[PDB]
């Protein structure tokens, strides 16, 4: 739900840093994120490629 | 631990590659036993039924031939003759090596 | 039309129904070709060379063939399940054969951002690289989806008839020719 909430407000965040958190495992959220998406039919953005590197590169 | 977690699909570890005699055996339980994967599991403890299954997929793209020869080379069967094979033949396998 | 290219086929599934019930047990001790874990599971696992395929028989005489190309290459490989349990002694037969699935796949030799087809077919397209490469298309008319790869190549699943693959394949055809 954040996922896609910080997607709408195109915050930049990643998998990794959320699933680290929740005990999470790639194929249970992926899977559910898979299920929720095509049961609600919600839009969402994509992660832009740009979007990432400005947040990515000031933690050098 | 830092926020720099990389994540990529780690599903294919790393299983023992199949040996030739191992191979050679796999289909003599064919010729013997069939294609019953969960007793050639138990035949072949080191590998599980999914690796039987695998193993059965992979050579079946162009040893199919063999497996179909190797089937109709029909042998009597015996657990304890087949488990002495494997351990000799193993072993054997190591000494010329 | 296309471009000079039709849809292949890659996988069939199908049901049909023995008409008896069935001892699993007897089957996997008897069966060559057989597979089966009575403590775990309700059905038996059986091979056969040709056609290449698979039979999932349960107890309860429902059955499940894969592997085929074509239907009738299904229909075969169901006839010669049938006849291996009838050798087995049961009163099998072959009754109400259905095809379920069919999966096909096509090229059309030059490459698809997939970035654009997602931007301008959202409500059908599903792009996560970081999940899977491929775009995923929910195509309405035939009840069909498509598997799209960057190369160029197309798979489609979900069709009961070929005419719904091809359908599918000459619908998507001047979306992806833009």
């Given at each position: 739900c954040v996922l896609i909430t910080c997607r709408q407000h195109n915050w930049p965040l990643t998998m990794g840093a959320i699933c680290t958190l929740l005990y999470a495992d790639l194929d249970v959220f992926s899977s559910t994120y898979m299920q929720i998406v095509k049961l609600l039919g919600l839009d969402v953005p994509s992660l832009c490629l740009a979007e990432l590197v400005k947040t990515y590169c000031s933690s050098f | 631990g830092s926020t720099t977690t990389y994540s990529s699909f780690r599903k294919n570890y790393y299983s023992k590659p199949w040996s030739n005699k191992e191979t050679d055996m796999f289909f003599l339980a064919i010729s013997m036993?069939?294609?019953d994967f969960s007793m050639i599991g138990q035949l072949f403890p080191h590998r599980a039924r999914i690796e039987i299954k695998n193993k059965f997929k992979r050579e079946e793209k162009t040893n199919g031939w063999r497996i179909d020869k190797a089937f109709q080379e029909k042998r009597p069967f015996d657990f304890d003759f087949f488990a002495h094979l494997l351990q000799k033949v193993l072993a054997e396998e190591e000494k010329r090596k | 039309g296309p471009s000079g290219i039709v849809p292949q086929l890659q996988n069939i599934v199908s049901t049909v129904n023995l008409g008896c019930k069935l001892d699993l047990k007897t089957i996997a001790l008897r069966a060559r070709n057989a597979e089966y874990n009575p403590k775990r599971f309700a059905a038996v696992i059986m091979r056969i060379r040709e056609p290449r395929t698979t039979a999932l028989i349960f107890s309860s005489g429902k059955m499940v063939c894969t592997g085929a190309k074509s239907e009738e290459q299904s229909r075969l490989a169901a006839r010669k399940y049938a006849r291996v349990v009838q050798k087995l002694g049961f009163p099998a037969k072959f009754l109400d054969f259905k095809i379920q699935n069919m999966v096909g796949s096509c090229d059309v030799k030059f490459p698809i951002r997939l970035e654009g087809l997602v931007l301008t077919h959202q409500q059908f397209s599903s792009y996560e690289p970081e999940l899977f490469p491929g775009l995923i298309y929910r195509m309405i008319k035939p009840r069909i989806v498509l598997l799209i790869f960057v190369s160029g190549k197309v798979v489609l699943t979900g069709?009961?008839?070929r005419a719904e693959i091809y359908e599918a394949f000459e619908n998507i055809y001047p979306i992806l020719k833009g």
């Open positions: - | 036993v069939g294609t | 069709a009961k008839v």
